[PDB]
């Protein structure tokens, strides 16, 4: 097996992963046929022309974040690598562009360094460069020099498609840029003025990022320097006249008050326009520029609020009706009190508008009937408002917003999604969900809802398939709760412990049995320790129950038989999570009453000192058993007699100091065994060896206190004989003794 790297052939190329292995130098034991080498997050301090000596087929090298506790690179160190195309050298404290880089380079990343001069000696010979990243070298309150770009430095790069110079002090757009450019990033570069000459001849440019130039600095979560008097970026009327192929334009945080419509007259394919963190409330109301954007699919006008103004309504121009290709509209942080039906008339005839994002607007009232008149809304995102009852910075990420999905894909897969989470809908009245479309995914998480659901609250939206009611104070005091949602498949009641933790009040979970199609139920972190009248959970359909963060230590108290069959009635259950239940021991009768249909059982992060392995005989379909983070001291020596279906056995973070002789004899089905972070001093050959067919492909042993005397030789010989079983984190499978090998890996 390879060491220190994890070498894998996927598919024509051979990849070597040597990241985060505290390597002081590049290892001279890397496979000769490796093509892509990842040495990021190590303590490597020096690179010479001998560092990559016998690796002639090397096309990619990643030396990011080296050292971790600056990287010294000699001139022409990678010059013998005639096949090197991609070289990542980010966060290396490099003071200059390395001299003598190979002419074969197609991608070069020098992000997060101290490089303040872009010179011809450094990059003019790299005529094959397609992607060049020099972002985040001088920014924020970092002590750094102004970025000098030598005249015509990028001119010879006739194949350059991507150039990123963001988060550097430039002041001006660098002149003499190659016409082959497709993507030009100049975000946070202190460029206050864009003339007609700056983007001249860039007829192939599909993306231009000019965000953070003359930024809007009020309430900035980062060091922010505005232009003189909080002034706007000055973009000439003809600045984008040759940008005929532009698809992406980012003007976020450029302190814009006006959008010149003439900017888009020669830009017929503009698809994505970011105008977040500007002063465009006036332009949103009048919007002459909206008539010039027929192909636009994504428009972001978030956080354009006027400081000190909380208006009653949102003023949307009738020209929003000209955005025929619009798919998503982001209007977060506009800030207004009420959304009326007539306010969104300009968007109601757009055929592909599937997403409307109105989060963080402090909205108190909404006429929900307005969403019905839309052509085909699929995501109505109203999270984080004040709706009451109806009466450090990652350089390869978006700096001004999270690119994550608004709704969970598992919820949105069912159909129309309505997100009303993080609001104040503390009580759902009889007409709360009146006049809403056929909502399939509904999120009412964190609404301070302390009501007793009784089977009538969701009757106007009866086709909800995924319901999220997490982080509320729900009072489960009625057996008919949620039963009106006949087709409900996923129900999340996590973090509704308020009333469950009070013994004196009544608790009713009988409604679970009345669903014919309920598949997933999450009752996590509810502190459930007592139920009224019905002590059992029953369901002919339920497939998964998450019961983590409850009190099975109390429910399965030795002197109490009432909750002994609490899960037996879940006749179709395949996945059960009993983690975080403070279980010191599970009664044998309680374990025997778990559904026999179980394929995955999690009992991790409890306090189990013992586990009766014999009881696995009554679970003929158990594939995954997870007992991590317990206090188990012993393992059974005849697991084959108790199970013939177990594929994954997780036992990490326990107190197992001995692996029984013949532990894996005749098991056959076991593929993954995790014994990491236990107290194993050694592994005897007999504890792993087998006389039957073995499907063991993964064995984890990192974090065990291994005594590296000659007694560890039988295990090392076993490792050499069984290359098919992968032992991950081989550098963390460290010797604890003797002294002369205390920090070394087992392989030595």
Ligand X SMILES: *[C@@H]1O[C@H](CO)[C@@H](O[C@@H]2O[C@H](CO)[C@@H](O[C@@H]3O[C@H](CO[C@H]4O[C@H](CO)[C@@H](O)[C@H](O)[C@@H]4O)[C@@H](O)[C@H](O[C@H]4O[C@H](CO)[C@@H](O)[C@H](O)[C@@H]4O)[C@@H]3O)[C@H](O)[C@H]2NC(C)=O)[C@H](O)[C@H]1NC(C)=O
Ligand Y SMILES: *[C@@H]1O[C@H](CO)[C@@H](O[C@@H]2O[C@H](CO)[C@@H](O[C@@H]3O[C@H](CO[C@H]4O[C@H](CO)[C@@H](O)[C@H](O)[C@@H]4O)[C@@H](O)[C@H](O)[C@@H]3O)[C@H](O)[C@H]2NC(C)=O)[C@H](O)[C@H]1NC(C)=O
Ligand Z SMILES: *[C@@H]1O[C@H](CO)[C@@H](O[C@@H]2O[C@H](CO)[C@@H](O[C@@H]3O[C@H](CO[C@H]4O[C@H](CO)[C@@H](O)[C@H](O[C@H]5O[C@H](CO)[C@@H](O)[C@H](O)[C@@H]5O)[C@@H]4O)[C@@H](O)[C@H](O)[C@@H]3O)[C@H](O)[C@H]2NC(C)=O)[C@H](O)[C@H]1NC(C)=O
Ligand U SMILES: *[C@@H]1O[C@H](CO)[C@@H](O)[C@H](O)[C@H]1NC(C)=O
Ligand V SMILES: CCC[C@@H](CCO)Nc1nc(N)nc2c3ccccc3n(Cc3cc(CN[C@@H]4COC[C@H]4O)ccc3OC)c12
Q: State yes or no: residue 448 binds ligand V (CB under 6 A).
A: no
Q: Please identify, among the stretches 45-53, 139-147, 240-248, 406-414, the one whose residues bind ligand X according to the rule CB under 6 A.
A: 406-414
Which one of 35, 113, 361, 421 is in contact with ligand Z (CB under 6 A)?
A: 421
Between CA 40 and CA 108 the distance in angstroms is 15
Q: Which residues contact 247 (CB under 8 A, 6 or more apart)?
A: 206, 207, 269, 270, 271, 272
Q: State yes or no: residue 600 binds ligand X (CB under 6 A).
A: no
- Whether residue 687 contacts residue 660, with contact meaning beta carbons closer than 8 Å, is answered with yes
Q: Please identify, among the stretches 6-14, 93-101, 500-508, 688-696, the one whose residues bind its own copies according to the rule CB under 8 A.
A: 500-508
How many chain residues bind ligand V (CB under 6 A)?
A: 19
Phi, psi (rounded to 5 degrees) for 443: -120, 115
How many chain residues bind ligand U (CB under 6 A)?
A: 41
Which CB sits closer to ligand V, 256 or 335?
335
Q: State yes or no: residue 443 binds ligand Z (CB under 6 A).
A: yes
Which CB sits closer to ligand V, 186 or 528?
528
28-60 b/e with 16+ CB inside 10 Å = b?
Answer: eebbeebbbbbbbbbebeebeeebbeebeebbb
Q: Which of residues 49-78 bind its own copies (CB under 8 A)?
A: none
Helix (H, G, I), strand (E, B) or coil at 123: helix
Q: State yes or no: residue 605 binds ligand Y (CB under 6 A).
A: no
Q: Return the C-alpha torsion angle 566, 567, 569, 573, nearest 10.
A: 170
Minimum gap (Å) between residue 359 Cβ and ligand V: 10
Helix (H, G, I), strand (E, B) or coil at 319: helix
Give residue 594's region: left, alpha or beta (phi > 0; psi -120 to 50): beta
Phi, psi (rounded to 5 degrees) for 737: -145, 160
What's 637's DSSP letter? S
Q: Which of residues 362-401 bind ligand Z (CB under 6 A)?
A: 383
x/- track of binding to ligand U for residues 109-148 (CB under 6 A)? -------xx---------------------------xx-x
Q: State yes or no: residue 259 binds ligand X (CB under 6 A).
A: no
Phi, psi (rounded to 5 degrees) for 47: -130, 125
Q: Which of residues 518-557 bind its own copies (CB under 8 A)?
A: 529-530, 532, 554, 557
Q: State yes or no: residue 478 binds ligand V (CB under 6 A).
A: yes
Which one of 31, 333, 587, 705 is in contact with ligand V (CB under 6 A)?
A: 333
Largest CA distance in the chain: 85
Give residue 525's region: left, alpha or beta (phi > 0; psi -120 to 50): left
Q: How far is CA 78 from CA 98, 119, 598, 740, in A?
A: 10, 19, 55, 36
Q: Please identify, among the stretches 190-198, 431-439, 488-496, 633-641, the one whose residues bind ligand X according to the rule CB under 6 A.
A: 488-496
Minimum gap (Å) between residue 79 Cβ and ligand U: 8
Which one of 228, 559, 720, 740 is in contact with its own copies (CB under 8 A)?
A: 559
Helix (H, G, I), strand (E, B) or coil at 538: coil
Q: State yes or no: residue 514 binds ligand U (CB under 6 A).
A: yes
Helix (H, G, I), strand (E, B) or coil at 136: coil
Q: Which of residues 442-471 bind ligand X (CB under 6 A)?
A: 443, 445-446, 468, 470
Q: Which of residues 456-485 bind ligand Z (CB under 6 A)?
A: 468
Q: State yes or no: residue 248 binds its own copies (CB under 8 A).
A: no
Neighbours of 157 (CB within 10 A): 22
Q: Please identify, among the stretches 67-75, 84-92, 334-342, 406-414, the one whose residues bind ligand Z according to the rule CB under 6 A.
A: 406-414
- Whether residue 664 contacts residue 688, with contact meaning beta carbons closer than 8 Å, is answered with yes
- Whether residue 247 contacts residue 209, with contact meaning beta carbons closer than 8 Å, is answered with no
Q: Which residues bind ligand X (CB under 6 A)?
A: 383, 407-411, 421-422, 443, 445-446, 468, 470, 490, 492, 494, 520, 522, 524, 544, 546
Q: Which residues bind ligand V (CB under 6 A)?
A: 305, 307-310, 333, 335, 360, 362, 386, 452, 454, 475, 477-478, 499, 504-506
Q: Which residues bind its own copies (CB under 8 A)?
A: 139-142, 218-219, 221-223, 303, 332-333, 360, 384, 386, 392, 422, 424, 426, 448, 450, 473, 498, 502-506, 529-530, 532, 554, 557-562, 610, 681, 705, 707, 736-737, 739
């Amino acid at each position: 097996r390879s060491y220190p790297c994890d070498e894998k052939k996927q598919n024509d190329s051979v990849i070597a992963e040597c990241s985060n292995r505290r390597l002081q130098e590049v290892p001279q034991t890397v496979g000769k046929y490796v093509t892509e080498l990842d040495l990021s997050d190590n303590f490597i301090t020096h690179i010479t022309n001998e560092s990559f000596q016998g690796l002639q087929n090397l096309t990619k090298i990643n030396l990011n974040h080296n050292p971790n506790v600056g990287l010294n690179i000699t001139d022409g160190a990678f010059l013998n690598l005639k096949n090197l195309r991609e070289l990542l050298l980010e966060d290396n404290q490099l003071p200059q562009i390395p001299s003598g880089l190979p002419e074969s380079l197609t991608e070069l990343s020098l992000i997060q360094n101290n490089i303040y001069n872009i010179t011809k000696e450094g990059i003019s010979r790299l005529i094959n460069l397609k992607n060049l990243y020099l972002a985040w070298n001088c920014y924020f309150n970092k002590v750094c020099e102004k970025t000098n770009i030598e005249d015509g430095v990028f001119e010879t790069l006739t194949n350059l498609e991507l150039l990123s110079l963001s988060f550097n002090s430039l002041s001006h757009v660098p002149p003499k840029l190659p016409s082959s450019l497709r993507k030009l990033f100049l975000s946070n570069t202190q460029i206050k003025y864009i003339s007609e000459e700056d983007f001249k001849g860039l007829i192939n440019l599909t993306l231009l990022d000019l965000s953070g130039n003359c930024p809007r600095c009020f309430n900035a979560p980062f060091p922010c320097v505005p232009c003189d008097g909080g002034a706007s970026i000055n973009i000439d009327r003809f600045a984008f006249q040759n940008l005929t192929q532009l698809r992406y334009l980012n003007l976020s945080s450029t302190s814009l008050r006006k959008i010149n419509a003439a900017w888009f007259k020669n830009m017929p394919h503009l698809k994505v326009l970011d105008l977040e963190f500007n002063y465009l409330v006036g332009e949103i109301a009048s919007g002459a520029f909206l008539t010039m954007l027929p192909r636009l699919e994504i428009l972001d006008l978030s956080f354009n609020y006027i400081k000190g103004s909380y208006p009653q309504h949102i003023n949307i121009s009738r020209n929003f009706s000209k955005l025929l290709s619009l798919r998503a509209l982001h209007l977060r942080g506009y800030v207004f009190q009420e959304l009326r039906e007539d306010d969104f008339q300009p968007l109601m005839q757009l055929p592909n508008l599937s997403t409307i994002n109105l989060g963080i607007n402090f909205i108190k009232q909404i006429d929900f009937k307005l969403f019905q008149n839309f052509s085909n809304l699929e995501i109505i995102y109203l999270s984080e408002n004040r709706i009451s009852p109806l009466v450090e910075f990652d350089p390869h990420s978006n700096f001004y917003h999270f690119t994550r999905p608004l709704i969970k894909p598992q919820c949105a897969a069912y159909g129309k999604a309505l997100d009303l989470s993080l609001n104040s809908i503390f009580f759902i009245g009889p007409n709360q969900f009146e006049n809403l479309p056929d909502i399939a995914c509904l999120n009412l998480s964190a609404n301070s809802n302390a009501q007793v659901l009784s089977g009538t609250e969701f009757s106007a939206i009866p086709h909800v398939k995924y319901l999220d009611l997490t982080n509320n104070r729900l009072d489960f005091d009625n057996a008919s709760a949620l039963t009106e949602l006949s087709d409900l498949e996923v129900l999340d009641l996590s973090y509704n412990s308020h009333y469950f933790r009070i013994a004196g009040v009544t608790h009713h979970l009988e409604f679970i049995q009345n669903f014919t199609n309920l598949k997933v139920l999450n009752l996590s972190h509810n502190n459930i320790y007592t139920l009224t009248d019905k002590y059992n959970l029953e369901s002919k359909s339920l497939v998964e129950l998450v019961f983590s963060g409850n009190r099975l230590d109390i429910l399965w108290n030795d002197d109490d038989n009432r909750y002994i069959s609490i899960f037996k009635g879940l006749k179709n259950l395949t996945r059960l999570d009993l983690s975080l239940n403070r279980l010191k021991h599970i009664p044998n009768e309680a374990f025997l009453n778990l559904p026999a249909s179980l394929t995955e059982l999690h009992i991790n992060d409890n306090m189990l000192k013992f586990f009766n392995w014999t009881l696995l005989q009554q679970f003929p379909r158990l594939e995954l058993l997870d007992l991590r983070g317990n206090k188990l001291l012993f393992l059974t020596d005849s697991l084959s007699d108790f199970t013939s279906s177990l594929r994954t056995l997780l036992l990490s973070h326990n107190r197992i100091s001995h692996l029984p002789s013949g532990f894996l004899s005749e098991v056959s089905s076991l593929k993954h065994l995790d014994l990491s972070s236990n107290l194993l001093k050694t592994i005897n050959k007999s504890a792993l060896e087998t006389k039957t067919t073995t499907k063991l492909s993964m064995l984890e042993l990192h974090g065990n206190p291994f005594e590296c005397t000659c007694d560890i030789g039988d295990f090392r010989r076993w490792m050499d004989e069984h290359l098919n079983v992968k032992i991950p984190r081989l550098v963390d499978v460290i010797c604890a003794s003797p002294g002369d090998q205390r920090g070394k890996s087992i392989v030595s």
